[PDB]
Design a protein around this ligand. Structure first.
Ligand SMILES: *[C@@H]1O[C@H](CO[C@H]2O[C@@H](C)[C@@H](O)[C@@H](O)[C@@H]2O)[C@@H](O[C@@H]2O[C@H](CO)[C@@H](O[C@@H]3O[C@H](CO[C@H]4O[C@H](CO)[C@@H](O)[C@H](O)[C@@H]4O[C@@H]4O[C@H](CO)[C@@H](O[C@@H]5O[C@H](CO)[C@H](O)[C@H](O[C@]6(C(=O)O)C[C@H](O)[C@@H](NC(C)=O)[C@H]([C@H](O)[C@H](O)CO)O6)[C@H]5O)[C@H](O)[C@H]4NC(C)=O)[C@@H](O)[C@H](O[C@H]4O[C@@H](CO)[C@@H](O)[C@H](O)[C@@H]4O[C@@H]4O[C@H](CO)[C@@H](O)[C@H](O)[C@H]4NC(C)=O)[C@@H]3O)[C@H](O)[C@H]2NC(C)=O)[C@H](O)[C@H]1NC(C)=O
Ligand SMILES: *[C@@H]1O[C@H](CO[C@H]2O[C@@H](C)[C@@H](O)[C@@H](O)[C@@H]2O)[C@@H](O[C@@H]2O[C@H](CO)[C@@H](O[C@@H]3O[C@H](CO[C@H]4O[C@H](CO)[C@@H](O)[C@H](O)[C@@H]4O[C@@H]4O[C@H](CO)[C@@H](O[C@@H]5O[C@H](CO)[C@H](O)[C@H](O[C@]6(C(=O)O)C[C@H](O)[C@@H](NC(C)=O)[C@H]([C@H](O)[C@H](O)CO)O6)[C@H]5O)[C@H](O)[C@H]4NC(C)=O)[C@@H](O)[C@H](O[C@H]4O[C@@H](CO)[C@@H](O)[C@H](O)[C@@H]4O[C@@H]4O[C@H](CO)[C@@H](O)[C@H](O)[C@H]4NC(C)=O)[C@@H]3O)[C@H](O)[C@H]2NC(C)=O)[C@H](O)[C@H]1NC(C)=O
Lengths: 216, 428, 428, 216
């Protein structure tokens, strides 16, 4: 019900001490000394770094000093590294079984730039080429807006039919991704030497191919 | 290994009933040992907890879903239960079967609670096929990725489903259209690329589409040629046999096949006794193609060529054995002793000028007496002022050995001179 | 132009009648001026004369075909006549309408006298497409050729039927099966190949087959790379700017596009201020790709590379700017004067030893006084005995100028020495 | 009727005098002095070199001395060249209009070797590809026996149907030449990447192609 109230962001330089917090509800942070700090990396589920007010297990280092004063529980990641860019959050018990978990703090090492990965091109399969079909496609993976476009070529010129291009949304790294496909039969693929695909994405516009020609 | 996987899905419209469930295979609990959770994520928002249960005896549900929820278990059958009664407009979320350790870390697959009827239609495929431009160390990553489906889980299998070494089945998407797209990479050795067949091989049973595709890398090779003199004692001797030779080097091991063309004059000789040979040099070959010459033809101002054609060469490297035009010259062969300030040194050195010459068909040498000497450097000549050529020759010896009275002889074997050799001679 | 062309054909069986004929357009005669002949060639034999006629009044036929033949004319209509009555088994021959000059030289097309019914079915085509391997002078011959027909004449037309310069429509065959095959070559300039579109374009109206096809040649090109030092005064000076450079040369004009890859260390720098430039050199380009270096990185034992990738190169020429391992050495800089036997010469020369050195990062020079000197040759060093390097430097001057008391200074700019320069100095 | 009886062959070295003859029939060599020597080059019809017993026109040189003694007419080509390898024959009149012509003499410069030209490969035309057909072919031009073979490949392997290969005979240079063709429809050419053709000819056997691959 209760959300454990965390500072929304906190920043430190490399070689500085970063502190984070967590304000409870009786039955959790204040009740017991069982306050639990975690570290999540955008791709998977959270790891364990601190529980029980400065009680840590194995693998995790000397640097992590987390505890509680008042009902503001604290975590201090001193002498920080480029490794520590992650989603850190507080937790605590309630009694019997239940527990309340935090609203998150984003830790930053100071200053930030841009990044890009892949848009390929693929044919059909021989599972469909068998009982008449050639369904090709065009993949526009990963970006951060939810606004990309697509269009194709077939021997270099504008095509107009049978292509279903549809709109992008979020992944497990919380970046959006896109879909497209065009449908012909064996014969129309067999007549055609090329199928080039052109995506765009906010001025970063593309006429793509990894392909070093098409031949044999 | 542990699995948690959910059922009960569909799209329905508020003021009636739906019953979701989750079964597990490869770790014990359900309720007995630890606890269980159920989450919800609205389309555009993130994760919110909906309930909790213990060992068997305390189920506490969320203030949104409090008094409302029922999060129950079936311990002996190892299955979970979410029977609920009134999922309104906003409650349509990504519900997932969340086992607990110490907080909520093993992720299920989940099954979508959605709102009013729905369809089920098609995927297809994408293979991340690798960039030759190198990343650091013995790292190489290629892939596969699957596009535009309706219902989710898929079976993206690598090299029919085997080679789950350096594989990262990269996570999915649920688009703004409502569609899907995920990846699957192969992070194995860089050398093991080209050397082996890798196949991306998908399957989708919600509709019926299956697939398969491959890989390759790149690096260095593209050859060099040269053409060479007959010996002047072979050409001046009526009884000894001259010849022009075409060395082709840096051939490769992926493109051996070196063909030659031979023009004695403009008219193809074709043959004569032109003999190549391809032998295993360092990691390429050395090919020695070999013309037979009757003395006179050289001496009667003949033009020669070797048009080397290998496939690794788009365009055939021709080379003319071409002599040059002329000034007379016969080298101005004058060897020289030191600057006296080298008898204050354990080691002296000796000179040998050969200036004033045309052609650059030079062959200088040195000696100690009847036998040769090892330490010498000879300049490969500069086109002089009065339109000639010139060079300098070394012999790096000892002062101690010099004042012993050693007879160093700078043997020269250059051209408009007497014995197609002249030797200037030096000592102290 | 003259044409003679025959009619009346078919296959028939001995003991009844056939009437052959020949009409002409572009020269006068028939009978009036000269004479006319008719020939015959059995399938496997050659040419035999069957009759003769004059101005108008004397027809003499062959002892095989004597009393039998009638070789007649139609002067005013310009047409010829061969009405005969009993062409037996062997008489089936290649009959052709043979105008006379002084003996029987203008050839008709002819029409076959053959024996018992016959068919008429299909051709097709063949284009002699040229061998790159050169024939002598400004000669190049490519073609076309037509195969497997029944009835003859065809319409083999070059570049829709235009370019009858260097064309030899090479002559036909009448096979042992009874079939046909001829050629048609284009003997034009060798340079004009690739530069132009040539098309073989046939047509056959006895059945219905028409056609069209092209050409191309080949010759030399496939590039070279090199990597170069920052200046040692740029690297030792905290205030002057060092840099590593990658020259790619022999690029071409049919494959410009030279891409670079730049590894400061193993980790791609990618950028820094690497700047290429493609400028019109001799008949290729010179591309100068340019890294920016902060002094220290060179001096803190860094490895560098330039992986040049052009399309004319199947496989990318990498080159590491790699220094070498080590012995100390600082050149054993001792310049030397002549052998006295050069004061019996109008022109003397001067030496400059620089032995005992490691790296081969040499930069020797000479002078007259404050200004430089033009005539010198410097050896690009030999790996010595005690594991060092060595060279020799020249200065080709005059004895007259030497005894005037000239101060020649062999300026050296090699390495473990003091001012990243040391100069030894020489005179008489 | 009468054939003018010529020596069947005659040989000379380079720098030697070659003589040829021609024995008549009254009304021709013996009658008049109108005896006519010719020079034919294997590809075209005969040129004029001598007529009227040593009466020559223009273009032809000083070397050609031809006349008649008895009824054996003669031609002498002194100080011979490599140019003079041709079919030389006598002729003469009959009266009114007619004339008798010789049986030939083959002049040789002393000593002789072997020679070879072309076997190509060609597709259809777009004149047939239009109204369903792809007729390909295989040409084996020029040789001296009348005995050649052919066979094809289609992606490298033995084919068995629809190919008509038929037997060789003489040209205008009197060397034999051959024919072949195979007939399919657009689709079967379109499915096939290659068609290689293999001729043979008396141990000189061939798996041919000028082709540097097939591609685009
Ligand atoms: C690989 O490899 C390497 C490394 O490794 C190695 O190591 C070792 C240790 C071992 O192990 C091995 O095994 C290994 O392999 C490398 O490679 C490299 O590379 C480089 C770079 O990259 C390149 O370069 C190139 O090259 C060239 C060379 O040259 C020369 O030299 C050298 C030194 O000396 C040598 O060694 C070489 O080889 C060469 O040599 C030559 O050769 C020839 C042939 O082979 C020879 O000849 C001969 O002789 C005689 C005659 O004359 C005799 O006789 C013989 O035989 C006969 C004949 O002849 O014929 C046979 C007959 O049959 C017969 N006859 C009768 C008559 O009978 C007779 C007999 O005798 C009987 O007995 C009688 O009875 O005979 C013959 O064989 C000759 O001699 C030699 N030589 C001399 C000198 O001596 C270089 O140089 C170059 O450069 C150039 O460049 C280019 C491009 O790209 C172009 O552009 C041009 O060419 C240039 O240039 C110029 O030019 C001009 C004119 O044009 C001139 O003059 C100028 O001067 C120039 N300049 C310049 C500056 O240069 C190229 O570059 C290469 O490739 C290689 N190699 C080397 C050496 O270097 C790599 O890296 C590796 N790796 C991988 C991964 O792979
Ligand atoms: C074409 O052409 C020709 C003829 O013609 C001509 O003529 C004339 C008269 C006119 O007309 C024109 O136009 C024409 O074109 C020919 O070609 C040729 O060919 C050949 C054969 O075939 C070839 O060869 C090759 O090459 C090479 C060369 O090298 C060098 O040298 C020369 C003499 O000297 C020169 O000239 C050249 O070029 C080169 O040079 C160089 O370069 C570079 C670049 O370019 C430079 O650098 C620079 O520097 C500095 C730095 O360092 C400066 O700085 C500058 O700038 C800069 C930079 O740097 O970066 C910019 C920046 O941004 C900035 N920065 C900052 C920091 O800021 C700066 C600035 O400065 C500012 O100011 C500051 O403030 O900076 C740069 O640029 C350099 O320096 C130079 N160098 C020198 C030395 O000096 C050769 O050599 C070679 O060989 C090799 O071979 C190969 C192969 O195949 C390989 O294997 C290898 O590489 C070999 O080798 C060896 O190696 C080793 C190692 O590895 C070494 O060490 C050794 O020794 C070696 N050995 C040997 C024996 O060799 C190749 O071969 C070519 O190609 C060409 N060229 C020539 C010259 O030769 C043809 O034939 C024709 N034709 C047709 C038809 O096309």
């Amino acid at each position: 019900p209760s959300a454990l109230t965390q500072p929304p962001s906190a920043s430190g330089s490399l070689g500085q001490s970063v502190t984070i917090s967590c304000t409870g509800t009786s039955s959790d942070v204040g009740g017991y000394n069982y306050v639990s700090w975690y570290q999540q990396h955008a791709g998977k589920a959270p790891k364990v770094i601190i529980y029980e007010v400065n009680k840590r297990p194995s693998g995790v280092p000397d640097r992590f000093s987390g505890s509680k004063s008042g009902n503001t529980a604290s975590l201090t990641v001193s002498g920080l590294q480029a490794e520590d860019e992650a989603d850190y959050y507080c937790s605590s018990y309630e009694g019997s079984d239940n527990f309340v978990f935090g609203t998150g703090t984003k830790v930053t090492v100071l200053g930030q730039p841009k990044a890009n990965p892949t848009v390929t091109l693929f044919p059909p399969s021989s599972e469909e080429l068998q009982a008449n079909k050639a369904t090709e496609v065009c993949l526009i993976s990963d970006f951060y807006p939810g606004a990309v476009t697509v269009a194709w070529k077939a021997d270099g010129s504008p095509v107009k039919a049978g292509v279903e291009t549809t709109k992008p949304s979020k992944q497990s790294n919380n970046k959006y991704a896109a879909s497209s496909y065009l449908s012909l039969t064996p014969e129309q693929w067999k007549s055609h030497r090329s199928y080039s695909c052109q995506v765009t994405h906010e001025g970063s516009t593309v006429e793509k191919t990894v392909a070093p020609t098409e031949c044999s | 290994p542990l699995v948690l996987q959910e059922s009960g899905p569909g799209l329905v419209k508020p003021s009636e009933a739906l019953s979701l469930t989750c079964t597990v295979s490869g770790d014990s609990i359900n309720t007995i040992l630890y606890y269980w959770s159920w989450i919800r994520q609205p389309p555009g928002k993130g994760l919110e907890w909906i309930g909790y249960i213990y060992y068997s005896g305390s189920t506490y549900g969320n203030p949104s879903l409090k008094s409302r929820v029922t999060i129950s278990v079936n311990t002996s059958k190892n299955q979970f239960y979410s029977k609920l009664s009134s999922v309104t407009a906003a409650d349509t979320a990504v519900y997932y079967c969340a086992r607990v350790p110490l907080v909520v870390n093993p992720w299920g697959q989940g099954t979508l609670v959605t709102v009013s009827s729905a369809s089920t239609k098609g995927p297809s495929v994408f293979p991340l096929a690798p960039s030759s431009k190198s990343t650091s160390g013995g790292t190489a990553a290629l892939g596969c990725l699957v596009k535009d489906y309706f219902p989710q889980p898929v079976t993206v299998s690598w090299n029919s489903g085997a080679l789950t070494s350096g594989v990262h089945t990269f996570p999915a998407v649920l688009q703004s259209s409502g569609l899907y797209s995920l990846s699957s990479v192969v992070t194995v050795p860089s050398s093991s690329l080209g050397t082996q067949t890798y196949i991306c091989n998908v399957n989708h049973k919600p509709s019926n589409t299956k697939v398969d595709k491959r890989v390759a890398p790149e690096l260095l090779g593209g050859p060099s040629v040269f053409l060479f003199p007959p010996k002047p004692k072979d050409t001046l001797m009526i009884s000894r046999t001259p010849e022009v030779t075409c060395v082709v080097v840096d051939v490769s091991h992926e493109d051996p096949q070196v063909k030659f063309n031979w023009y004695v004059d403009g008219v193809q000789v074709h043959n004569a006794k032109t003999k190549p040979r391809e032998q295993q040099y360092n990691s390429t070959y050395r090919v020695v193609s070999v013309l037979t010459v009757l003395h006179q033809n050289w001496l009667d101002g003949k033009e020669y060529k070797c048009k080397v054609s290998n496939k690794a060469l788009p365009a055939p490297i021709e080379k003319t054995i071409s002599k040059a035009k002329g000034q007379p010259r016969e080298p101005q062969v004058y060897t020289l002793p030191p600057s006296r300030e080298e008898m204050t040194k354990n080691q002296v050195s000796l000179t040998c000028l050969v200036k004033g010459f045309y052609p650059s068909d030079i062959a200088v040498e040195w000696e100690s007496n009847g036998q040769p000497e090892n330490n010498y450097k000879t300049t490969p000549p500069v086109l002089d002022s009065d339109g000639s050529f010139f060079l300098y020759s070394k012999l790096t010896v000892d002062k101690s050995r010099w004042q012993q009275g050693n007879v160093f002889s700078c043997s020269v074997m250059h051209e408009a001179l007497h014995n197609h050799y002249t030797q200037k001679s030096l000592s102290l």
